[PDB]
Amino acid sequence: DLPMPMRFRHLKKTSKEAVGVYRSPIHGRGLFCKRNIDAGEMVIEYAGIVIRSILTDKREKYYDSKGIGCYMFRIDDSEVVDATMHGNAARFINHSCEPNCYSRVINIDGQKHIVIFAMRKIYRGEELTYDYKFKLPCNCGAKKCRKFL
């Protein structure tokens, strides 16, 4: 509808009104919508620090040794977004084999941002989920479940 940079500019204030973090029956805590989200709507940024992929093993190791949950989003084989210290509510988005959301790497004014889009209209109360990029069982509960993450 509106160009990608024109759609990114409006998020921080609107995401606070559109989504919340609560207990999820899929796993631990999840992201849920507080009001209906239109199909194609830019929901929230997966906020954090873009770091080199080779650095993730040691960073995860450091966080695990401190008893701090490690929240990372895989961009590609070379970069990852570390949402552990400088993240937002998007770090709680669970995986699903019938997602209602999808992740995209956008580039606004030279800077890379991971944004979450709604692929269908999402209704008040629904949990927001995306198909994770990647031995680990899946609890999304969908009919067409891949049964592993």
Ligand X SMILES: Nc1ncnc2c1ncn2[C@@H]1O[C@H](CN(CC[C@H](N)C(=O)O)CC2CN(Cc3cccc(Cl)c3)C2)[C@@H](O)[C@H]1O
Show binding-site residues for Zn(2+). Answer: 140, 145
Tokens of 74: 């895989």
Distance CA 134, CA 138 (A): 12
28 binds ligand X (CB under 6 A): yes
Counting DSSP H helices and E strands in the chain, the numbers are 3, 10
Among positions 86-105, residues that touch ligand X (CB under 6 A) are 92, 94-96
67 binds ligand X (CB under 6 A): no
Helix (H) or strand (E) holding 101: strand 101-108
The site map against ligand X for 106-145 (x = CB under 6 A) is --------------------------------xxx-----
Sign, Cα dihedral of 65, 66, 71, 77: negative
Distance CA 92, CA 20 (A): 10
Nearer to ligand X, 18 or 127 (CB): 127
71 binds ligand X (CB under 6 A): yes
Minimum separation from the CB atom of position 112 to ligand X (A):
20
Question: Site residues (CB under 6 A) for ligand X?
Answer: 24, 26-30, 69-71, 92, 94-96, 138-140, 149
